[PDB]
Write a protein that binds this ligand. Structure first.
Ligand code: HPA
Ligand code: HPA
Ligand code: HPA
Ligand code: HPA
Ligand code: HPA
Ligand code: HPA
Lengths: 241, 239, 238, 239, 236, 239
């Protein structure tokens, strides 16, 4: 029944049995979305796909435009796939974590619809950033599949593009975070401001700075993606049905 | 001595206060959120500013406001701020006179010392609030026998959204007792202008994670309607 | 091997340095803070750039591209800082080995806007270990009071920190605090330029000193400290 | 219903308190700090027990409590003098803690030691009886007294007071006040299913929360200005 | 040859014969219960029940296992779960611990002794024994954490909400009253030791109600089976 | 001013120092951990005490200090070998701490225990004496040795060394170095109104701060390498 949107890398589009047979190049009041909207059918449910970064560094992706376009195209739930670094010792490379909280360390990103010309200011609650029904459907799928996961975790959302500093990971860890990426916020909040239920699925693509012995290389990360993307796809499959 | 009050309207509902008209001012830093209301109270020249003018806290022109009050003769400032109670002793109802703050804001025009200006000034800001003003407020709270706290750390955050349970947890680890969106750059801008400044904080909700439910704009408006009166009592004694 | 130095002027009042050029260069990112001075010290091509010419508005991109364009193969950056760790009082030299970014709004990367590829640099160790050792080696030789390692807080400014702010920063692990370490250190890596920092403590951080921190007190510590800092720079360049 | 008060004597100085006195008790755990003083307060039966006469780490809480349970106590009010970590909780402040953190060690801390047949791990999530907590708050409010409705009580070991750095760590752990008597008392009340609340008087700012060093004269003075306040609060709670 | 320290019921494992039930004395008082030798899939097996936490004779226990010929130890622990990812019924294989106990006989190097050894205790659990545990949890498709920090509190009482929060502030994930000095003692006797902890309740203030023995014992009743399946494999 | 040096022998190799053998004294608190030596260094009186003569947590510190004071000690320099937690305090480094945090327990920590008729709670805000600190500092400068003028000393129980996670918690509590002998030593020194300072030599990078694990051999090399440095300091402070 309910229409789902999936935000993430293409190749999530290589999900077996998904059709994606439309491409509207949308222009919103908030400017250009990242890629055109792709609308399709999967296991009998209407499905939406937005590439988060087009064919743009995380801190300049027009998330506002993305979420408006999806709300409008008829989204009623958004599953956001996120590549992260693992801070928690148990959340190593290849691990899947379904966060339940986040701490936002971003700045200078268009992060609300309640700015510029508005006639009342609203302060959305945001105590629990992820819709709980979605989180459970992700968990139920991950248990069913016997994939190694954490059912909770705190998402540190940093600014990039640069990776983090060892003492910077020290502080994120002292702050309670389990995992760290650059694209979680303001996405989750803009979803909230639109009453759009949103939940994040996170693939750990590297140990965060200082956890492994060497240094973080883009090929370590590229490999990890390639390795784990199929696992993510299996989870979306079960969730989408 | 002339006194600015920054906070909401309703502050203007103070018994005994008169207001004589409101001039619109042009500052070198843009437009202030609202016209200044110049008035008289207990034989003391007073100016009021309604900081939100309908503006989100992150886009308020604090620079324009402060320069505006300075130029209009201000000599001290009491800022009335609505906050979230992190500390367990500071529930809905509570009044707090913070003595310290931690700024988590970011994209705001936050200093008078920007652009090619031939000389840059680094202000001390060790003690963000003028103590004599702080003592004026505390005395008033004691004298009125109201439930308050004499000290506390103010966490100033970006908004317009409210904080995450985990973000609150982080704030609690930084030593804050309350959280709001309006305290900074306001407090620092005043010191850049050598304007003694103090805040009076009203706890209008528990911070995310401290109450049993989610925070509703309904409960927060109720805590204001119930709390603006006691605030008015405090301002009154102070002037 | 060509070293560049970023910091105040008077860092050039270095004895035996024949400083010859004043090159005003233009960059794809706008103007650098000052003209690049080129010179020779000890028979090594030596590059100077005064970053001063508001820390949060300094064109850090322009400065580093300039240095890179001019032929720099390493960078020593000199920073005035407030001291958080109790062992690191007024006058203390420190060679930080880590840093924590608390800044924002600054044009902090080369990978911004219209580009066909985004590069997420590793940045686990903000500072080059070799350069660190050249600095460490020199302080030891000159018998100066210093610290081998230490954590740099970089804060927005131009305002100093609040007592509570310093408490947060200490809780985070910071030994020192300053407004210019970042994004400079990061842009250096983006340019594959080895970068290292020599910090001089010019005030105890807020609430570590007695009363307030005056500009005057800071001024006298720069006056007193620049002497030491030159001697270190001399030895490194040598 | 029978309320038992633990604190110094001179709490016994309530106007219109008959000190009906009292008998030396024996316990399977030893000798209690003082003979129990049994009295009446406006219809109510009240028990008193001075926890001294003995350094805090050597007080025999096990006997004290056991004896108080055996004498028929149904509720225990504990009065405690403390250093004040939280900026808002200076000298002479009254606090009513809601949580505690235990840093004590060499103490006979449980009735479930020894070679015993069934082990019991009590839940101790909320270390103070909430009904008792309200009864103290209500009393404080009604008397217009400056106080804190909540706080975290650090129980250290003594007899020496704390180091500056130790205080920084108690603060990072989230403690508001610091004292030497609060545990294992609160816990031992619980193993006996005996409602228990503490009322705390800050007698000194904790180490390094002020310029000098902590003096035993400062504390004497704070108990002098403090004691009367504490007594009026018991009069109400008892009534 | 392996030794398992946990409750009895770990000896309700299918495939295990318990032969000798000899009660040993040691230079450090009596152990918690007699030692029980056996075989499981052709390996010599020591089992030893550790039954009040702060008064159990951990010294006497390990020395006994050492002298009986133990060449590795698996300690099974009931714990409360601080980490939000580790609820009731989770299995955790910790890699670190932080020790908040005291008043316990914690070292073989006290009293008399001609020489005093300050052992290194950087890594309290043995990596190869963790890996065998983890390998096993993977094969059985059980929900677990490969790593985690163990807080060892004093008891017998449970923790305060604020005690828990400072344990959380310290980087801890689980909490139990029996992890220390067991690990450290094992180390002083060059015995490889690892722990497998079963979360049996959310730590204080991590959930709705209070912590109760009804709740904790159900979780133990529920979990014991998974635990036995893990040990069965690890001895295989 | 008469100094007592507490440390290993090897501190006794000072050139020009002479020492009378032992004589074993009995104290009210049992017997000191070694022969206490009386000395002269160029005519000046010095006491020497080796604290080990037993593991760190069973050392009779109560007895040592009581012995030291009965024999006329006016000040105390204690020389401690510690692991370094701070990045800038590698092996070989000298540190003059200014604060400390006690993580010990079960040790005889006070003179004011037992069944006495008066109790003393000392202030202990500043565990090390500032005049002695500077004497050590001025000395280390005079010899131009690398050192730290300040730092926080974590005093742990032992005999085992610390876990990587324990080190991370000691680090979060703001400690710079960790040893197992510093307390209750300093505190006892105070109960006796004896000015006490520590000089701490870093013998190993604390658990989890370098590639390997910590070997006893590595530590023993480190001492044999830094005791020479410490002797020099002592010689200067004693002159
Ligand atoms: O290590 C990381 N840090 C921040 N963002 C990331 N996205 C993938 N890995 C990382
Ligand atoms: O909960 C809060 N968080 C931030 N700002 C606020 N202003 C009122 N309440 C809050
Ligand atoms: O206190 C400081 N904070 C930030 N920058 C500084 N530069 C010198 N001192 C300081
Ligand atoms: O400062 C304090 N510390 C410990 N115990 C106390 N009891 C009263 N004040 C204090
Ligand atoms: O909640 C707990 N705390 C301490 N030990 C435990 N053992 C099981 N649960 C717990
Ligand atoms: O690493 C250490 N930890 C505790 N005590 C010590 N004594 C020397 N090194 C150490």
């Amino acid at each position: 029944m309910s229409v789902y949107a999936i935000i993430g890398g293409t190749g999530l589009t290589q999900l077996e049995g998904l059709t994606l047979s439309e491409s509207l190049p949308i222009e919103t009041p908030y400017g250009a979305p990242s890629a055109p909207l792709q609308r399709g059918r999967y296991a009998g449910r209407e499905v939406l796909f937005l590439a988060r970064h087009g064919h743009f560094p995380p801190h300049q992706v027009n998330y506002r435009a993305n979420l408006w376009a999806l709300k409008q195209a008829g989204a009623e739930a958004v599953i956001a796939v996120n590549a992260v670094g693992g801070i928690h010792a148990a959340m190593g490379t290849g691990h899947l974590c379904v966060p339940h909280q986040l701490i936002d360390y971003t700045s200078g990103r268009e992060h609300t619809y309640f700015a510029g010309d508005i006639e009342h200011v609203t302060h959305i609650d945001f105590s629990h950033p992820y819709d709980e029904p979605l989180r459970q459907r992700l968990i139920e799928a991950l248990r069913a599949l016997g994939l190694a996961h954490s059912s909770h975790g705190v998402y540190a959302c940093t600014q990039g593009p640069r990776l983090e500093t060892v003492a910077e990971i020290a502080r994120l860890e002292r702050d309670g975070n389990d995992i760290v990426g650059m694209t979680g916020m303001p996405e989750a909040a803009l979803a909230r401001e639109l009453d759009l239920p949103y939940a994040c699925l996170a693939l750990v693509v590297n140990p965060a700075a200082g956890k492994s012995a060497g240094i973080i290389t883009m090929a370590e990360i590229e490999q990890a993606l390639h390795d784990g993307i199929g696992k993510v796809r299996e989870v979306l499959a079960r969730v989408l049905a």
